[PDB]
Amino acid sequence: NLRKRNELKSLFKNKSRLSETYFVELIDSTLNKRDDRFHGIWKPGQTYQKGDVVYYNHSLWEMQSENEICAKEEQTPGISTDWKSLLKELEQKVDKLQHE
Amino acid sequence: SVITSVSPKTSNQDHMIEEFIEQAIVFNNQKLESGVLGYESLNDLELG
């Protein structure tokens, strides 16, 4: 949040010595997928925790279960009852009104 | 002047030839820099 690519690139030159403040600024300024809760695309074989956000087909899903889970091959967001999404609830509701 | 060779029966000097040994080698080549980025292996950066 603090710095840009052109500011971070300014600390790593050809004749300088390393220091811990450079890595502190490097770690704080990029996105930590564990601490900010965002993992990108769903993959089987991972482990997730309560609150994680994941993109599966055309929707973002938040995990509801409070204990860690192993992402199983044949359990996928939409099939299981761990995950949740609003773009599907609202989709079905509007489909219902359209049909009615 | 005309150039010729050295001989142990016209002078008392010869050509000096000895054997080169690999394990007894010493290098004479100093590093231009040390301890900074771009000049050391990743194992040797101490994060000063």
**Cβ count within 10 A of residue A83:** 25
In one letter, which amino acid is A53? V
DSSP, res A98: H
| Mutate: best of B32, B34, B36, partner A, most A CBs <10 A | B36
* Percentages (nearest 5) of helix, strand, coil residues in chain A: 30, 15, 55
CA-nearest of A70, A39, A69 to A52 is A39
Q: Which residues of A63-78 are buried (b: 16+ CB within 10 A; e: fewer)?
A: beeeeebebeeeeebe
Which tokens hold the place of A6? 């052109």
In chain A, which residue's Cα lies nearest the Cα of B45? A18
**Does the beta-carbon distance from A16 to B37 stay under 8 Å?**
yes
- Is residue B37 within 8 Å of residue A12, measured between CB atoms? yes
Tokens of B8: 């142990």
Question: Cβ atoms within 10 A of the Cβ of A48, count?
Answer: 19
B3 phi/psi in degrees, rounded to 5: -95, 130
Where residue A37 falls (left for φ over 0; alpha for ψ -120 to 50; beta otherwise) is: left
> What technique was this entry resolved by?
cryo-EM
Q: How far apart are CA B41 and CA B32, in angstroms?
A: 15
CA–CA separation, B34 and A88 (whole Å): 60
CA pseudo-torsion sign A55, A61, A62, A67: negative
> What is the residue type of B37?
L
Question: With contact defined as beta carbons under 8 Å apart, do B38 and A14 qualify?
Answer: yes
Residue A61, beta-bridge partner list: A54
**3-class secondary structure, A84:** strand
Residues 6 or more apart from B6 whose CB is under 8 A from it? B13, B14, B15
Q: Tally C-beta pairs within 8 A across A and B.
A: 22
Kind and range of the H or E element at A63?
strand A59-63
| Rounded Cα–Cα distance for residues A15 and B33 (Å) | 9
The CA distance from A22 to A82, in Å, is 40
